């Protein structure tokens, strides 16, 4: 049960933390249509976070989505390093979004065949949203990559700058493997063909280059984060930390 709890929490944390990042964009986008789009995506992802986290709390037999989101520190958070990356410029946000959406599509597609029924149902809802996200993020990848020289250059830099964190998308640990062998979880290593087929094509159509640097950064799933996560949680959790144990 502990393995399933940790696995479920990882998925929730990915969505929680990415949703947080998107929230920072509110009112700051290049166009009103983009503000709307980013808030929409952030809202979908928070929805998924609430679902995964609620299930994790049920699996653990205590707490709820709020005890989980607001009373864990950065050493307990299990999100992918990719989702805690700063928003940076719009290309940075689009690169991070596209890498994650391609992954979510590949993952939730397979995870809706989980032998765990609750995981299956969560994934079945999530996949419909992830498909929307991918259309948006890939759409913007192409627009920026094949826009102006300036936008082309920013889209390439954005891709290059996040690349090293893509290794964690296909990292498997014993929790991944044990649960995958029970037909409950998806072994992330087996997601690479699908993700690469998507992402390589998108980058190519965008008239951009797949980075040649071999991706090497992992640790998020084990609670070993970049220095970006601590200040995110400080901001996210302040009120709950100041006034704990209340209803809102």
């Amino acid at each position: 049960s502990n393995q399933l709890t940790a696995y479920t929490l990882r998925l929730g944390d990915n969505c929680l933390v990415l949703s947080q990042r998107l929230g920072e964009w509110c009112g700051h986008a290049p166009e009103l249509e983009i503000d709307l789009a980013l808030a929409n995506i952030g809202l979908d992802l928070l929805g998924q976070a609430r679902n995964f986290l609620s299930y994790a709390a049920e699996l653990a037999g205590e707490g709820d989505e709020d005890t989980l989101a607001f009373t864990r520190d950065e050493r307990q958070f299990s999100n992918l390093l990719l989702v805690e990356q700063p928003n940076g410029n719009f290309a940075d946000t689009i690169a991070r979004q596209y890498f994650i959406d391609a992954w979510h599509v590949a993952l939730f597609t397979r995870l809706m065949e989980s032998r765990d029924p609750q995981l299956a149902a969560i994934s079945a809802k999530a996949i419909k949203e992830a498909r929307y996200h991918l259309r948006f993020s890939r759409g913007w990848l192409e627009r920026l990559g094949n826009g102006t020289d300036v936008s082309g250059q920013k889209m390439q830099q954005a891709i290059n700058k996040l690349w090293r964190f893509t290794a964690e998308l296909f990292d498997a640990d014993e929790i991944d493997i044990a649960l995958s062998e029970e037909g409950i979880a998806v072994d992330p290593r087996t997601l690479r063909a699908a993700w690469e087929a998507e992402v390589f094509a998108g980058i190519n159509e965008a008239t951009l280059n797949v980075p040649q640097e071999q991706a090497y950064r992992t640790g998020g799933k084990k609670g070993l984060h970049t220095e970006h996560l601590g200040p995110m949680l400080a901001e996210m959790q302040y009120l709950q930390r100041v006034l704990p144990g209340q209803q809102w």
Binding site: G27, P30, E31, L43, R50, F90, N146, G147
Partner: protein, 304 residues
């Protein structure tokens, strides 16, 4: 003698047949609607900022999801209003620049800072509450596209106003610290919300023509009075107070009589010298300037 165009217009207004984009209208009527609808749209956009300020800090995932949905809706409402405004022959991009330049206004209320989570529920409750009273009162505004935008907007917004009230009720029923937080937010937002209705009937330059042309269907003071009558019972339900020593029920008239608004503050605010005016415009100007390469990329890509 009015021209025949002018006379026919007055007659249409009197019989309450909606004016539509292809109908003749006095140039001063066209322009006051571009002014009013445009600044209504501007308000939706700027209004995302005070609430947006708390998206990353909201205390529960539920309240955070609600706030995100609300801000998404405001963006959507901005879009509706810009489309409405454009049926009058203006361009969204032009009036938006005028907002950035300080040449057009947005609602005074968005120049106030969100200093606590309670402020967010109070904005949903009092600020959307005030907007809704004004907007429902504009559902029979004489210009069709504007009237229909008001209907669509009010249908969506009243839901979020209710959610704002419930967030306030959580605080009202919660710990002593939560209650104190709620009261303080009310103390800071009460009078600003009252100001959303506009200046007094005696000091309202646009009212004469707007009322004549059935753009405005109730006076600023009439709407403000209804808001107070409707809202005081809601304050009571929360067990809270209003920062108004002069507020009292007048059985003789059946209204809540309330104290004088600070019109000196009101004038400061709408003229760019309130608490957050500079910061709001700086944030929208920054969004626009830093987003330029994105917009130029989109345009360049579309042509290819």
């Amino acid at each position: 003698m009015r021209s025949t165009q002018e006379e026919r217009f007055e007659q249409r207004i009197a019989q309450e047949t909606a004016i539509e984009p292809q109908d003749w209208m006095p140039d001063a009527y066209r322009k006051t609607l571009i002014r009013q609808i445009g600044q209504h749209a501007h308000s939706e956009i700027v209004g995302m900022l005070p609430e947006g300020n708390w998206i990353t800090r909201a205390p529960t995932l539920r309240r955070k999801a609600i706030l995100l949905a609300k801000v998404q809706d405001e963006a959507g409402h901005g879009l509706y209003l810009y489309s409405a405004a454009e049926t009058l022959g203006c361009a969204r991009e032009d009036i938006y620049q005028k907002m950035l330049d300080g040449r057009m206004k947005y609602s005074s209320i968005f120049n106030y800072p969100t200093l606590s989570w309670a402020d967010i529920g109070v904005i949903g409750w009092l600020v959307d509450g005030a907007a809704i009273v004004n907007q429902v009162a504009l559902c029979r505004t004489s210009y069709g596209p504007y009237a229909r935008a008001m209907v669509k907007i009010c249908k969506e917004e009243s839901f979020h106003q209710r959610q704002g009230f419930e967030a306030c009720m959580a605080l009202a029923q919660g710990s002593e610290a939560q209650k104190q937080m709620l009261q303080d937010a009310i103390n800071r937002f009460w009078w600003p919300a009252l100001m959303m209705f506009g200046p007094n009937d005696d000091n309202s330059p646009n009212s004469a023509r707007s009322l004549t042309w059935k753009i405005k269907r109730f006076t600023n003071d009439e709407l403000r009075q209804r808001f107070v009558d409707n809202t005081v019972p809601q304050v009571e339900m929360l067990g809270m107070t209003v920062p108004d020593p002069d507020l009292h029920f007048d059985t003789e008239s059946g209204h809540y009589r309330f104290g004088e608004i600070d019109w000196q503050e009101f004038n400061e605010v709408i003229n760019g010298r309130g608490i957050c005016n500079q910061e709001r415009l700086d944030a929208k100007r920054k969004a626009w300037e830093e987003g330029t390469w994105v917009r130029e990329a989109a345009l360049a890509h579309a042509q290819k």
